[PDB]
Amino acid sequence: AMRQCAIYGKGGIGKSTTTQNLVAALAEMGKKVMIVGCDPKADSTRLILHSKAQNTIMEMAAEAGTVEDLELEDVLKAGYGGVKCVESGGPEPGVGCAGRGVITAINFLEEEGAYEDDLDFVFYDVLGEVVCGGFAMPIRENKAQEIYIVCSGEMMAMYAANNISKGIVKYANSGSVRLGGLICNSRNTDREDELIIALANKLGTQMIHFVPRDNVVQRAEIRRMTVIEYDPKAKQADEYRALARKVVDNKLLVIPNPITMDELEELLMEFGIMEVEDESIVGKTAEEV
Amino acid sequence: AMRQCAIYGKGGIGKSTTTQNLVAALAEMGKKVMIVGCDPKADSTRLILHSKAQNTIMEMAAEAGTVEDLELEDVLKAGYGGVKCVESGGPEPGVGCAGRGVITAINFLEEEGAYEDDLDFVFYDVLGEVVCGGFAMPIRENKAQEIYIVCSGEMMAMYAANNISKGIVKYANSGSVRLGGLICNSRNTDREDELIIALANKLGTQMIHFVPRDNVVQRAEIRRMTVIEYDPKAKQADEYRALARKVVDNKLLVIPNPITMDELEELLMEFGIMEVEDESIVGKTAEEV
Ligand code: SF4
């Protein structure tokens, strides 16, 4: 019943916002959901709590001395729709692998039996910028089963998306770690919907949603809350409900097929974000050409 | 004579472009420089080599079996102005700390006596997104002495700049690792020049340069080359020469003074990128307000 899910993707494309907003649609339709905040900024829970920045397991363990001197009630908060929220906390600048904050944070929650407490969903909001051993921690430790990659029709978000996938693949043979699909966050670039579906099937998954750039997300997030919470009778709000729908309904859980550099640039050139570079101009000064 | 330098800063603000371009200015004014490519994409050497993507120590060790089956001549290339170039290589997606690629890469170069070979400069192009143990590796192993942080008048690039600094500070007491200054890459935001000098002196360093958003950089980089190489008699070109000038001349090497979150938002609000948020609208639906 209780599924183990993760949201992976790069920063600056509104990953957390779509994660939180999704989780809110999912709460209002009956489910009890818990978000684990694996990003080094506390932005993973912000909108559900109406918080400036939630208290994290790292800064609080730094407080009470050790990780066990914390009580569950202090780290794990609940906001909108009784959505349980924790921020894992960043690696202490200079020292500390990021992924070791996350084991600390999951371990702590297993031992205070939050996982065995009545729950339908867990959602790890995870940075999928570089996929190092550190950010791969939910996948290697098999705490995330269903991976949904948020991305956009833009080079880095895509490369990012592929890499997340190569990680899924590393731990294919070890367990139930699978790519459930790609969510596109629009950047009002032309061909981006179908570019992300080109990528989605060339990987062997779908593009389970397309999230439109609606200026109500901005207006709801300045009030530190979801769009499902701010204006439930909105266009965008039903988009979040629709995504959240497709997610329960998803049965499509796969081991992906990473593509190469030339193949990513292929897809980037034919939909138009990338240009066909000229070979004769290369290495030549404006003197020359 | 041979100074050990590093360029730290976040992605997507044109760090490598300014690194490479700087290094070119420095080359035409007589010096012999080597760039070490610590970013997971091969973008750190690209413009000096006119290469699509240079061959990295990770993918080539994966080729010959072990790191010692590689010959110096294969990894270390030279381009414009006899600027020696290597790409370190990323962590293999899923497994591998990023910083362990970098020790491998430096170690390999110490042993084939590239460091003892006549050289005035070494420049580690390093991602300073999160400052984990992994990206702190040049600082903990004291291979970078002079850190220059490229940033912009934008929240994340500044936060990032602060964190790089907290890392400098961790290894204050261990050696000669010092913050030489902040380089601003313009994003044609109003107050950004003086915002980065606010930040610069609130940290205890200067803003050793301001690099203007000139559309010749774009036109030179599409030809896979520097602006010093493409059009030497250009406005931007002299900017790179001027930066490179101030760098030799720099004597100002410090241990920085990291600022807080409230202090960062202070500076963001008074120069105008950040807005003064309203307290009464928070937590309230459009029904309510
Ligand atoms: S695995 Fe990655 S998160 Fe951990 S230290 Fe290494 S580079 Fe940082």
UniProtKB/Swiss-Prot annotation, chains A, B:
One of its GO terms (biological process) is nitrogen fixation. ATP binds at G9, K10, G11, G12, I13, G14, K15, S16. Binds 1 [4Fe-4S] cluster per dimer. Its EC number is 1.18.6.1. The modification ADP-ribosylarginine is found at R100. It catalyses: N2 + 8 reduced [2Fe-2S]-[ferredoxin] + 16 ATP + 16 H2O = H2 + 8 oxidized [2Fe-2S]-[ferredoxin] + 2 NH4(+) + 16 ADP + 16 phosphate + 6 H(+). The reversible ADP-ribosylation of Arg-100 inactivates the nitrogenase reductase and regulates nitrogenase activity. Its cofactor is [4Fe-4S] cluster. Keywords: 4Fe-4S, ADP-ribosylation, ATP-binding, Iron, Iron-sulfur, Metal-binding, Nitrogen fixation, Nucleotide-binding, Oxidoreductase. Induction: Constitutively expressed during log and stationary phase in sucrose-limited cultures, its levels decrease during stationary phase (at protein level). Nitrogenase holoenzyme is subject to 'conformational protection' by FeSII; under oxidizing conditions FeSII binds to the holoenzyme and reversibly protects it from oxidation. [4Fe-4S] cluster binds at C97, C132. GO terms for molecular function: 4 iron, 4 sulfur cluster binding; ATP binding; metal ion binding; nitrogenase activity. InterPro entries: NifH/chlL_CS, NifH/frxC, Nitrogenase_Fe_NifH, P-loop_NTPase. This subunit is associated with the molybdenum-iron nitrogenase component 2. Homodimer. The key enzymatic reactions in nitrogen fixation are catalyzed by the nitrogenase complex, which has 2 components: the iron protein (component 2) and a component 1 which is either a molybdenum-iron protein, a vanadium-iron, or an iron-iron protein. Belongs to the NifH/BchL/ChlL family. This is Nitrogenase iron protein 1. The gene is nifH1.
